[PDB]
Swiss-Prot record, chains A, E, F:
GO terms for biological process: bacterial-type flagellum-dependent swarming motility. It comes from Salmonella typhimurium (strain LT2 / SGSC1412 / ATCC 700720). One of its GO terms (cellular component) is bacterial-type flagellum basal body, distal rod. Its main location: other. Keywords: Bacterial flagellum. The basal body constitutes a major portion of the flagellar organelle and consists of four rings (L,P,S, and M) mounted on a central rod. The rod consists of about 26 subunits of FlgG in the distal portion, and FlgB, FlgC and FlgF are thought to build up the proximal portion of the rod with about 6 subunits each. This is Flagellar basal-body rod protein FlgG.
Curated annotation (Swiss-Prot), chain G:
This is Flagellar basal-body rod protein FlgG. It comes from Salmonella typhimurium (strain LT2 / SGSC1412 / ATCC 700720). Signal peptide: none annotated. The chain holds residues 105 to 156 of 260 of the full protein. Keywords: Bacterial flagellum. It comes from the Bacteria. The basal body constitutes a major portion of the flagellar organelle and consists of four rings (L,P,S, and M) mounted on a central rod. The rod consists of about 26 subunits of FlgG in the distal portion, and FlgB, FlgC and FlgF are thought to build up the proximal portion of the rod with about 6 subunits each.
UniProtKB/Swiss-Prot annotation, chain J:
This is Flagellar basal-body rod protein FlgF. Signal peptide: none annotated. Belongs to the flagella basal body rod proteins family. It comes from the Bacteria. The basal body constitutes a major portion of the flagellar organelle and consists of five rings (E,L,P,S, and M) mounted on a central rod. The rod consists of about 26 subunits of FlgG in the distal portion, and FlgB, FlgC and FlgF are thought to build up the proximal portion of the rod with about 6 subunits each. Coiled coil: none annotated. It is found in: Bacterial flagellum basal body. The chain holds residues 152 to 201 of 251 of the full protein.
Curated annotation (Swiss-Prot), chains K, L:
This is Flagellar hook protein FlgE. The lineage of its organism: Bacteria, Pseudomonadati, Pseudomonadota, Gammaproteobacteria, Enterobacterales. Belongs to the flagella basal body rod proteins family. It is found in: Bacterial flagellum basal body.
Amino acid sequence: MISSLWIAKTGLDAQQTNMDVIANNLANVSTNGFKRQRAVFEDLLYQTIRQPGAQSSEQTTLPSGLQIGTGVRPVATERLHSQGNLSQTNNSKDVAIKGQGFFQVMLPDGTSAYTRDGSFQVDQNGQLVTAGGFQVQPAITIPANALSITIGRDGVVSVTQQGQAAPVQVGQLNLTTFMNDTGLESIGENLYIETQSSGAPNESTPGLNGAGLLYQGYVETSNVNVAEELVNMIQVQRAYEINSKAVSTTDQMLQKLTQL
Amino acid sequence: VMLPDGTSAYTRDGSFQVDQNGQLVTAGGFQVQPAITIPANALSITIGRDGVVSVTQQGQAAPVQVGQLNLTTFMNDTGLESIGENLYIETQSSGAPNESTPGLNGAGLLYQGYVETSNVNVAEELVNMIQVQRAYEINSKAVSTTDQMLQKLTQL
Amino acid sequence: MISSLWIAKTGLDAQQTNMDVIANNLANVSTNGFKRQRAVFEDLLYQTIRQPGAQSSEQTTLPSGLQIGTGVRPVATERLHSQGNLSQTNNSKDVAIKGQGFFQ
Amino acid sequence: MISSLWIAKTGLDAQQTNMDVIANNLANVSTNGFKRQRAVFEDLLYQTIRQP
Amino acid sequence: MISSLWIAKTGLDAQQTNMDVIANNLANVSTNGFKRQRAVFEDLLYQTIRQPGAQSSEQTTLPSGLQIGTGVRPVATERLHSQGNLSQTNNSKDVAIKGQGFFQVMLPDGTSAYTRDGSFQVDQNGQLVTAGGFQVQPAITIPANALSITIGRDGVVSVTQQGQAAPVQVGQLNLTTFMNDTGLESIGENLYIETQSSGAPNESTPGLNGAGLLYQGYVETSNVNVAEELVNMIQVQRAYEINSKAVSTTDQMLQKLTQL
Amino acid sequence: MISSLWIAKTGLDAQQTNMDVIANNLANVSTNGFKRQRAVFEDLLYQTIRQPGAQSSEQTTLPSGLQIGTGVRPVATERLHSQGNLSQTNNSKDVAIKGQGFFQVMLPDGTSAYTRDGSFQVDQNGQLVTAGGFQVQPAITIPANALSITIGRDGVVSVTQQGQAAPVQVGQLNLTTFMNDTGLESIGENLYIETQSSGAPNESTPGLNGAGLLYQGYVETSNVNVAEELVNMIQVQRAYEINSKAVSTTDQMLQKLTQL
Amino acid sequence: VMLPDGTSAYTRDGSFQVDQNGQLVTAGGFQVQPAITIPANALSITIGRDGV
Amino acid sequence: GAQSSEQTTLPSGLQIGTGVRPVATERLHSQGNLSQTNNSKDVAIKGQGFFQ
Amino acid sequence: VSVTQQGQAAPVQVGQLNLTTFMNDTGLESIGENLYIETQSSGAPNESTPGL
Amino acid sequence: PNTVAPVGRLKLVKAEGNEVQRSDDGLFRLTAEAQAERGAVLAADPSIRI
Amino acid sequence: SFSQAVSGLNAAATNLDVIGNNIANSATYGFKSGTASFADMFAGSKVGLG
Amino acid sequence: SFSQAVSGLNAAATNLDVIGNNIANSATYGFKSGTASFADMFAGSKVGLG
């Protein structure tokens, strides 16, 4: 019913969105291969009133007229796709990426999702699946009585059998790279699906075309840096408090109008 | 920045993203002028002091120049028309947009990895809210006094 | 009652689960043939708002839309089946495993 | 009050039992025809939040 | 709308400026060749009302009449150009200044800037540059097969080649001294440029009429005294408290007038 | 949201970078052929306000105007290329460098990296390889029937076969030197690749125009000094705590203002 | 917007819904021209800057 | 769903709701952590049974 | 009024902002758009360099 | 907004009370004596501001 | 900066494991001592991983 | 006082390294012992730098 109230309401909503992003980043400290999020804000509409540049006199112009702005809205959420610090879990089934590649897994619906998490398990059939049970692509199947699994820097998975002095190859772990990694649509479960803004899925081996190298026994931790999140929490709290003060000022103004 | 209709707008928000065909665009998807296309084999993108964009591909020990970030300088900055989403369009009070290299002809420098934040001073706005509120309460009282004077006059 | 509060509540629960896993690992130091546990987490659902890749104009797409996410959930607790150190008790009845078998 | 606290208290009590066994073994070095003790531990209950 | 509120607003802005200066000083503790800044304030205008010294009566005058003052404003921020304590980094290319001189570098634009920081590197062609890649003048060219670089107290840069008992001189490092050292315009990046208030750049040898002595393997750390900054932070916080209380008191007074 | 908050949010990040460098140096205190890092910082923007040297009157200039500055940014972490202490671990396959040269190693993708680590092994085919399995250049094969391997001070690799009183030369080890050793890009696994700031790879023999000398049975340890890292931790911790105190003071100042 | 009698009116209230046969309608139920029909297996509906 | 016009229907009409009520208080019958009280008489259940 | 040009360690003088002083300032005619015009009771507009 | 260009200027005239008379439709017109001295149509005064 | 130090702690633990294993086999016919070799995990320079 | 003390710490470390080098070369034909010389680094005369 009054412009300032709507503007401050939009400001409150934007600060709440910032706090939501902050809380999502903080809750995922222990998540492997998680990327922190950032919100981008833009100005809302601008009431024109006086046209800036209009003809005030026959030889003078109107410099920077009366533009009245509306509130704020978040543009988009962007991830920071950078290399997270590695952690040694001393597990033959855990693989970490050193560059800018993704693992391709198959959803139960038949469509393919992409995950940077390397915590893998072996199912009852021997196929290398993720922690949720989705099958990696291709089906890196594993023989029955394996003694050790060796995954090289270039994605060659080998199994050492008993009484055989040469390791046997049972698959080839490949990496998918995208033109735009920020455009992948997050669906949860550490899974990203393809969109039209994420380019096309470029399948490649680890070491060529830019795709990263694979390290066995390591996991890629999240890139969330806590101190930035704490300072941003302080920022969000104080900005929210200021906007609530503005809402209160508008309320008192309107009340004074009502009394007369 | 190039808008869908083809007219160029101007922005100072330096948060950019690569779209599905390469291409540096603003967070709203509008392509930045002039054109920089970043290939797939890129490992790291560096934007220099003078706006030169170099891309390092695997194997090559020398970075490959891709594009130039040209800054548009106006002579009357405040005369621009704010068209909404962090964009300004030129008007008759801010004519002659001058393309230039960053650092030359009075243009500014470029720092990569940093974004310019809002320059809103907070204490000034709070004191101004105090002034505005009390002022709207003294004008409302003037309205009430005029209303009472009119009521007394027209009552007789 | 507000989204950030639920996200932080989920984060607290996940960290508490991690602490329980650590405490369980500590309580079974003296147990024979014990394999330590490790908890794996996954990030929860995402509120979509603007869809990433949605066509804004007739030709320009929107990159990386407003994907506001929810908290975290633990998927699994996995054992580390690795050969522990063998200790000599010099007993005729105590048996130790050298490979990856199990007694039935 | 908290599951972690109960688990850690149980672990403390178990290690205290081990220490008591060791102390009793050390106290009876000079006794004739003595057989020293050894304690055997086991894992307690395992709550199934999600069934494997 | 009321005078006391403008005065208290000016006080708040001055205290915020002081806190900004303090934060800038504390943020550059680890910067080499940094000088701490101190802001100086002046009181604002004084309303005349009753001219002091006027004839109070035919035979008497008004002693110290009624002057009403406005708030406060900051005059300027002066640097403290003093020698910071030297730190041994044991590097043949790090150079520290013991006196009052500056190194001269060339910006890409062709102009000359001045920096006191001596953390130097060598480019791909052999010339001595700073950490930002700016070429130290007068150009010092280090040849391809250098074994050790010796920079003496008087600014001579010598290179000892293989099998030659004598060192080959490859340049001469000079220092620039200005009459007004605090008048330089700091552009960031540890760089100061000449202004008309900083006199003219006088080139001199490091050891002559007042240029400092160059130490190799030493770096000049910042002169920021941190305990003073903590005490000044306490002072600034309390002053901002009191000014905000003045604003709140003025707010409470105008309320009673509105109620009237 | 306020200036001092951003400045102290840059101070926190710079001190966190310094702690990261210190911790990384301390973690690699035992890796052979390691070069420790040093982070360098520089001043951010300097808001002009009143211009320093501005002409206030027609004859009086304003000295050292109101130059309010922004926080700090790190230029880079530079590698301190110094000679680590040599250790006599008495194996014929360990070689240490005495000068400033690098070994050339061929990466699996066809490009060449450069390493100063001298712990060499022999693969199943008889080639000299780095402990990570990367084959050395320009390829030095070692026969199966080898009795002793002798690598001289000039890089000549000789193998003595059974019952033969004369050694057999199986190759010649060469060292690569660069104009700028700091500009090399570290790719992990004790490997550095060439960058345009490192000039071009100049291959040379060990004892001539500037390549170092090779000692057999020796390993080059790291140059990390533990005590200096301890003192630097104590000073970085204090600086980080003081900058956090500045953050807290700004937070308290913003509280009272909003409450008003 | 298409009135029940068949003539076209004009509105600025942007609160739209979809009825049971697809189709975008206003809060009062009147159908909006041009005729925009959202399918059933929709997961998210995006209305762009240029009305796409 | 009422026929707003001769050929259209009313989507999502005017529903004004009253407050909130509590339906039921449900118990979480799960296995709590065990505490050892060193007592020959205290018994603990491991599964999903009750003492009568 | 002096401005700073790039690379020029010296400022460029642009202009002098002169102030007009009247004898009886209270006699000026306020015409609206924050402007005063001279009135016979506020005559003799004397231009001066400010400070003098 | 660069397209903004002048099109036409409103005619603004200066007339006192003693010169104008309200016609029957509410529009003021110049009186006879005033019209005889100031002409039929009033020339626009450049000093009028709106 | 926690993982970086954790990695160094693990490396020191591995070194001490090797030293203890070598010491325990001081008198064991046909035993050859072990030695642990370390390599850094630099990602793209300017930052360390441990 | 954290830069004046660090200097003394480094000087003592250098002296101890020299002493250790002298000790290690106790039996080395043609070896000459080494000693370290230290000097103050005063600036103004009221400000010591270590």
